[PDB]
Amino acid sequence: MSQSNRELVVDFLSYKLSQKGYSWSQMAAVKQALREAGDEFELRYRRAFSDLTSQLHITPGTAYQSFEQVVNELFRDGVNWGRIVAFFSFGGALCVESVDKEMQVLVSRIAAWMATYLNDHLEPWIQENGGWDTFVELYG
């Protein structure tokens, strides 16, 4: 498409800008901040994280239940930026595991569970603490 191409141009420029500590937009800044916070979390905890993610047994029929159990425990007593990063990293490892197991049908579903959870349980705390801007500023 032609809006396809424009989105490709924005994404690419967003990426080049961020590599130099600039931002195309607040949304681009949040995305890039998140990708790198996710990397730092996963590298920081590489052995422990990878061993945790190997403790889970995923099937298309029960993954949602497992996701709810992990996440509600993650946020049992509230929210902080650290937990939000762990939440994304977890979602990402769940998708990778799903594809490793030939369960790619789960991936779009995991995205929907996450977005819904953000929407309902996380966004109120985020906006209460200054918004995604606060996260960009501390997580570079």
Binding site: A48, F49, Q55, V71, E73, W81, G82, V85, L138, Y139
Partner: peptide, 21 residues
């Protein structure tokens, strides 16, 4: 299991939150 993963993520996240604060 899953819940006791979330509790040992919640280890990781709170002790990142105490790097990033």
């Amino acid at each position: 299991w899953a819940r006791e993963i979330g509790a040992x993520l919640r280890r990781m996240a709170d002790d990142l939150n105490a790097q990033y604060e």
